[PDB]
Design an enzyme around this catalytic site. Sequence first.
Site, PDB file in Angstrom:
ATOM      1  N   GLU A   1       1.024  -1.302  -0.006  1.00  0.00           N
ATOM      2  CA  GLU A   1       0.109   0.121   0.046  1.00  0.00           C
ATOM      3  C   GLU A   1       0.894   1.316  -0.160  1.00  0.00           C
ATOM      4  O   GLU A   1       2.013   1.361   0.679  1.00  0.00           O
ATOM      5  CB  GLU A   1      -0.941   0.191   1.368  1.00  0.00           C
TER       6      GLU A   1
ATOM      7  N   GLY B   1       3.011   2.799  10.998  1.00  0.00           N
ATOM      8  CA  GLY B   1       2.656   2.129  12.124  1.00  0.00           C
ATOM      9  C   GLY B   1       2.488   0.569  11.615  1.00  0.00           C
ATOM     10  O   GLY B   1       3.330  -0.175  12.551  1.00  0.00           O
ATOM     11  N   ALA B   2       1.639   0.244  10.903  1.00  0.00           N
ATOM     12  CA  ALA B   2       1.309  -1.170  10.523  1.00  0.00           C
ATOM     13  C   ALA B   2       0.541  -1.274   9.107  1.00  0.00           C
ATOM     14  O   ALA B   2       0.333  -0.336   8.656  1.00  0.00           O
ATOM     15  CB  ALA B   2       0.566  -2.134  11.638  1.00  0.00           C
TER      16      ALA B   2
ATOM     17  N   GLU C   1      -2.660  -3.892   6.867  1.00  0.00           N
ATOM     18  CA  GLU C   1      -3.553  -4.880   6.871  1.00  0.00           C
ATOM     19  C   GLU C   1      -3.620  -5.948   6.102  1.00  0.00           C
ATOM     20  O   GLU C   1      -4.670  -6.389   5.568  1.00  0.00           O
ATOM     21  CB  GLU C   1      -4.974  -4.027   7.096  1.00  0.00           C
TER      22      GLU C   1
ATOM     23  N   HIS D   1      -6.548  -1.544  14.950  1.00  0.00           N
ATOM     24  CA  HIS D   1      -6.770  -0.892  13.451  1.00  0.00           C
ATOM     25  C   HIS D   1      -6.769  -1.622  12.288  1.00  0.00           C
ATOM     26  O   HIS D   1      -7.553  -1.975  11.568  1.00  0.00           O
ATOM     27  CB  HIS D   1      -6.091   0.448  13.714  1.00  0.00           C
ATOM     28  N   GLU D   2      -5.523  -2.660  12.255  1.00  0.00           N
ATOM     29  CA  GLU D   2      -5.368  -3.455  11.396  1.00  0.00           C
ATOM     30  C   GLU D   2      -6.433  -4.669  11.329  1.00  0.00           C
ATOM     31  O   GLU D   2      -6.683  -5.271  10.221  1.00  0.00           O
ATOM     32  CB  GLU D   2      -3.804  -4.077  11.382  1.00  0.00           C
TER      33      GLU D   2
ATOM     34  N   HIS E   1      -9.573  -3.423   9.798  1.00  0.00           N
ATOM     35  CA  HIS E   1      -9.554  -3.284   8.256  1.00  0.00           C
ATOM     36  C   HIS E   1      -9.757  -4.489   7.584  1.00  0.00           C
ATOM     37  O   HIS E   1     -10.202  -4.517   6.576  1.00  0.00           O
ATOM     38  CB  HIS E   1      -7.995  -3.155   7.972  1.00  0.00           C
TER      39      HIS E   1
ATOM     40  N   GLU F   1     -10.034   4.318   5.809  1.00  0.00           N
ATOM     41  CA  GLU F   1      -9.299   4.542   6.872  1.00  0.00           C
ATOM     42  C   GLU F   1     -10.158   5.755   8.128  1.00  0.00           C
ATOM     43  O   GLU F   1      -9.869   5.228   9.309  1.00  0.00           O
ATOM     44  CB  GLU F   1      -7.988   5.770   6.312  1.00  0.00           C
TER      45      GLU F   1
HETATM   46  C1  LIG Z   1       3.331   7.529   2.754  1.00  0.00           C
HETATM   47  C2  LIG Z   1       3.081   6.099   3.193  1.00  0.00           C
HETATM   48  C3  LIG Z   1       4.094   5.875   4.035  1.00  0.00           C
HETATM   49  C4  LIG Z   1       3.902   4.500   4.590  1.00  0.00           C
HETATM   50  C5  LIG Z   1       2.843   3.656   4.287  1.00  0.00           C
HETATM   51  C6  LIG Z   1       1.800   3.887   3.327  1.00  0.00           C
HETATM   52  C7  LIG Z   1       0.632   2.921   3.524  1.00  0.00           C
HETATM   53  N1  LIG Z   1       0.041   3.222   4.487  1.00  0.00           N
HETATM   54  C8  LIG Z   1      -0.587   2.758   5.778  1.00  0.00           C
HETATM   55  O1  LIG Z   1       0.010   1.454   5.998  1.00  0.00           O
HETATM   56  N2  LIG Z   1      -1.054   3.429   6.711  1.00  0.00           N
HETATM   57  C9  LIG Z   1      -1.395   3.003   7.880  1.00  0.00           C
HETATM   58  C10 LIG Z   1      -1.239   4.260   8.617  1.00  0.00           C
HETATM   59  C11 LIG Z   1      -0.037   4.358   9.460  1.00  0.00           C
HETATM   60  C12 LIG Z   1       0.192   5.749  10.154  1.00  0.00           C
HETATM   61  C13 LIG Z   1       0.116   3.222  10.309  1.00  0.00           C
HETATM   62  C14 LIG Z   1      -2.723   2.514   7.829  1.00  0.00           C
HETATM   63  O2  LIG Z   1      -3.916   2.748   8.036  1.00  0.00           O
HETATM   64  N3  LIG Z   1      -2.452   0.922   8.033  1.00  0.00           N
HETATM   65  O3  LIG Z   1      -3.773   0.182   8.175  1.00  0.00           O
HETATM   66  C15 LIG Z   1       1.891   5.177   3.096  1.00  0.00           C
HETATM   67  C16 LIG Z   1       0.942   5.876   2.020  1.00  0.00           C
HETATM   68 ZN   LIG Z   2      -5.460   2.089   8.262  1.00  0.00          ZN
END
Ligand SMILES: Cc1cccc(CNC(=O)N[C@@H](CC(C)C)C(=O)NO)c1C
Ligand SMILES: [Zn+2]
Length: 890
Positions: free
Chosen positions: A124, A265-266, A268, A301-302, A305, A324
Site C-alpha cells: 500500500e 505503524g502497520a 492490514e 486498527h489492522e 480493516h 481509514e
Molecule cells: C506515505 C506512506 C508511508 C507508509 C505507508 C503508506 C501506506 N499506509 C499505511 O499502511 N497506513 C497506515 C497508517 C499508518 C499511520 C500506520 C494504515 O492505515 N494502516 O492500516 C503510505 C501511504
Molecule cells: Zn489503516
Amino acid sequence: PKIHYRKDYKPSGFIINNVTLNINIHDNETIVRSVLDMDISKHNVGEDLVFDGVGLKINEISINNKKLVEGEEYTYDNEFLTIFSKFVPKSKFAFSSEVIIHPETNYALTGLYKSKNIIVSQCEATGFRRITFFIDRPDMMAKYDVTVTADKEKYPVLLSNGDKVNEFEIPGGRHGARFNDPHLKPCYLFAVVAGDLKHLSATYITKYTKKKVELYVFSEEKYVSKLQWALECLKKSMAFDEDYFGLEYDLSRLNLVAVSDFNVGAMENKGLNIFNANSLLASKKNSIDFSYARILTVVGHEYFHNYTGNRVTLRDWFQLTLKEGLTVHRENLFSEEMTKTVTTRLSHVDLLRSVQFLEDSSPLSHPIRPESYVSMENFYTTTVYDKGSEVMRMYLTILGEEYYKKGFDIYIKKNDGNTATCEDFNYAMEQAYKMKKADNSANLNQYLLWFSQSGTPHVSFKYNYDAEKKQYSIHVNQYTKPDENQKEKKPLFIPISVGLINPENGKEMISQTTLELTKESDTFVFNNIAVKPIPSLFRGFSAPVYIEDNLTDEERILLLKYDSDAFVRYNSCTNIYMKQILMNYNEFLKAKNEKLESFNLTPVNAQFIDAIKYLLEDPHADAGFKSYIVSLPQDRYIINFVSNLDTDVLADTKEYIYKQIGDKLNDVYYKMFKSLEAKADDLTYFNDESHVDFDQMNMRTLRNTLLSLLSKAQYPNILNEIIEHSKSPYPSNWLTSLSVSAYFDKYFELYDKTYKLSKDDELLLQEWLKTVSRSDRKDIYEILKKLENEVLKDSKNPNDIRAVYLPFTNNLRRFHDISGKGYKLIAEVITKTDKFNPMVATQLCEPFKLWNKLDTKRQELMLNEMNTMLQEPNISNNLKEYLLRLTNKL
Ligand SMILES: Cc1cccc(CNC(=O)N[C@@H](CC(C)C)C(=O)NO)c1C
Ligand SMILES: [Zn+2]
Ligand SMILES: [Mg+2]
Ligand SMILES: [Mg+2]
Ligand SMILES: [Mg+2]
C-alpha cells in the site's frame, strides 16, 4: 507534475483474475516470476495494455507462451510496461513476466525490502508495482497463489497471504512454501515475509460459527518475549468486532509480524498484518506505558480493516477515507471500551484539534475525499484519518447505537467481496436514517458535504432565558472560511450533543439531546427550564468544529466543576486557558514591539486556580482527567488562533501562566505527587503481559506531569524526588526522571544512567532518544550533535531518525530560534533522508506546515529552507509535491 483527478475515474479495459507468483530470494537478488490470468473487460476499446512496473529488470515477457520483445511488441521505461494493442489478445489470456529486484538495497521500505535479517513487503499504496508488473490500483481485484523460496538456514519461516498449502525442500540448502489466498483482493493487500522468526500462538474460537482460528505473532528471536500483549490485543479486537458489529474472522490462520524498519505503524495485509516493531512489541520492564495503548490501538486498527478495507475495499484511492476514517472510528470505539478511561476520547480530540485543525487551515487543506493528487502517499493525512473518523463517528451520534449498527450492516453486507465508494456508505447510513425518522423522504444528501468541503467549521452560540416562561433558547451559527478548494462554503449537517446544567446546584436539567443544525443558523428553544442554565455544548466533541461557547470564565468554571461530560469540562478549561493565553500574548507582543520599559499582564483567574485545586484534591476525581487540567493547550492548538505568531512571545506567555498557577498550587502538586506513589507504582500485573490497568497508568501520567511542573518551578528539594524516581522499575518513571532533570546539573548523570538502561533494547533506546530530543535544555543543539555522532550515526531506520529530530522540532523556544538554525538543521535532514526514503522525508517536513502562521521573519526563514529543499536535484515526487503545495505553488 502528473495530476490524477477524482472526476476522471474509469474502470479498466482489462481484468486480472488470478495471480500466480514465484518469489525466489537469493543473496544478491530476488527473482519474481508471475503469471496473470487476464481478460478484456466490457469497457475495453482496443487500447494498449499498460502495466505499472517500477525499477524492475526484465528477464522475460510473454503472452500465451509467445515471447514479446522490447521495441517490437512492448516498451518499458522503468515505470510503465506498454504492450501494443496488436499483441493484446481479445479473450482470456495468460501474461507471464520474470523480473529481478533487490530487497537488500531497497532503503525506501516500499515494495520488497530487507529489515535487518527479515525480508518483508509493503505494497500500500503503490508498492506492488516495485515487486512485479500489475495494473496497480485497488479495483483490480484477483486471487493469489504464491510460492516463496529461500535459503533454509537464513530464512526458515516463509509467509504469504492465506492457507499454507505445501512446504518443500530444494537442492542447495533452499526451501519453499506455497500459499493460496481464497479471498479476491487488490494488490496493495499482498504481502510476503521471510526470516528467522520466532512466535507465540493461540487458538481463538469465533463466537457465532465456532470456527477455529490459529493466531500467530512473530518477531526476531531477541524480542520474542515482547509478543504477548500483541496477541492478547488481537484476541480483544476479535471479540470486539464480534460483540459490537457481529463480524467474524474469515481465514483459518492470522499472522502478525514485527519488523524493525517500517515507514508507518502497520499494514492490514490479508491474514498477514505487518507492524513497525514499536507498534507490536512491549514488555513492562523495557517499554513505557504509552507503548501498551499504541499496540492495542494499532493491532485493533489492522484487525478492523479485515472488513473495513479488505472484505469491502476501495474503488479508487480518492475513497481512502472510506477505509481509514471508518477504521479509525472502529479503532477509537474499540479503544474507549478496552481502556474505560475518559482520557482516551480526550486524547483523540486533542490530536484532531492540534494537528488536524492546523493542517486544515494550512495551504495543504483538503477535504477528506480529495479531488486530485500526484503521490497518493501524501494523502495519508490526519485529515483523511482523523477528520475522517470524526465524520464517520457523527453517523453514530446522529443515529444512535442500534440504528448505527443497522446502517453499518447494510453497508458491509451489500458491498462484501467488492469495491465501494463514500457514496455507498452514506447511502447505507441514509437507509438507517429513514428507518429511525420513520419517514422515507428523510435524506442525508447534505451529509456528503462532509466528504467534499475542506476547512473546519466555526460554531458560535448566543443564549436567552425568559424566567416568566421558564423557556431557554440556544441560537447557533456555523461558518466555514472560504479557501482554495471552495470559494463559497455551504452549511453542513452538524449534530450538537447538549445538556443544561443548573448553576445553583450543579445538576442536569434535561435528558441529553442532539440538536441537528442543518442551516447556517438556527434557534433551538427548550420549555420547562426552571432557572437560567449553563449550556453543556458539543458533548463528547460531537462534531469536528471550532466551538465558540460565548460563556464567561465564571460559567466555564462551574462546568469544569459540575458538568457530567468530560469533553465539555475539559473544553471549558481549555477555553479559560485560551482566553488567558491570547490576552497575555497580546500584552507581551505590544510591549515587545513598542519597546516599553514597563507594562502589565492580566493575571490568571483566581477562581479558576481554586477550581483546579478542588479537582486535584478530590480523591474520587479521575487522575488522567487531572493531568489534562494542569497542562496548557498544546502549541499547535494555540497557533490556530494567532496570526503572525511570535513563538518567543508565546513561550514567554506559557511560562508566565504556568508560573502564576504554580505559585498558588505547587504545595498541592507536591502533596499529590507523594500521596499518589503507592497506587501509581504498585506492581500488580507487572509480570502479566496480558493485562494493563489503564486507570493506574493514568496515575503515573499524573505523577509525571506534576513532577515536570515542580521541576521547572525548582520546588525545594525536588531533585531528591527526581533521583528516587530514576530508580523506579517503570520506564515511564525513569525516563521522566531524565527529562525533568533538564533543569539541574544532574542531567548529564541521568543521561548516562538511562542510556545504560536503554541501550540493549532497540525500542527502548529509541524512547531514550526521544526523551533526550525533547529535553528542555539550553544546550539542545550540542546534545543533538552528540546523538548524531554517538548513537544515530548513519542509521536509515526511520524510527531512529524520527526519534532524534521530531521531538526537538516541538521545542517552541529552540526549534524556532530567530537565527533559523533549527529550520536549517531539519531541512538538511529532510533532504538527506529524501535520497533514500521519500515517505519519511515528507513526514519530517511536518514542522514547516505552520510556516505561513508565523511572524514574518520566521515565515521568511522557513520559506527559504523550503525553496532550498525544492532546488535539490533528483528531489522525490513525494517531497516536491508536498513542498509545492505547502508553498502555494500547486
Ligand atoms: C506515505 C506512506 C508511508 C507508509 C505507508 C503508506 C501506506 N499506509 C499505511 O499502511 N497506513 C497506515 C497508517 C499508518 C499511520 C500506520 C494504515 O492505515 N494502516 O492500516 C503510505 C501511504
Ligand atoms: Zn489503516
Ligand atoms: Mg530494481
Ligand atoms: Mg489511533
Ligand atoms: Mg537499529
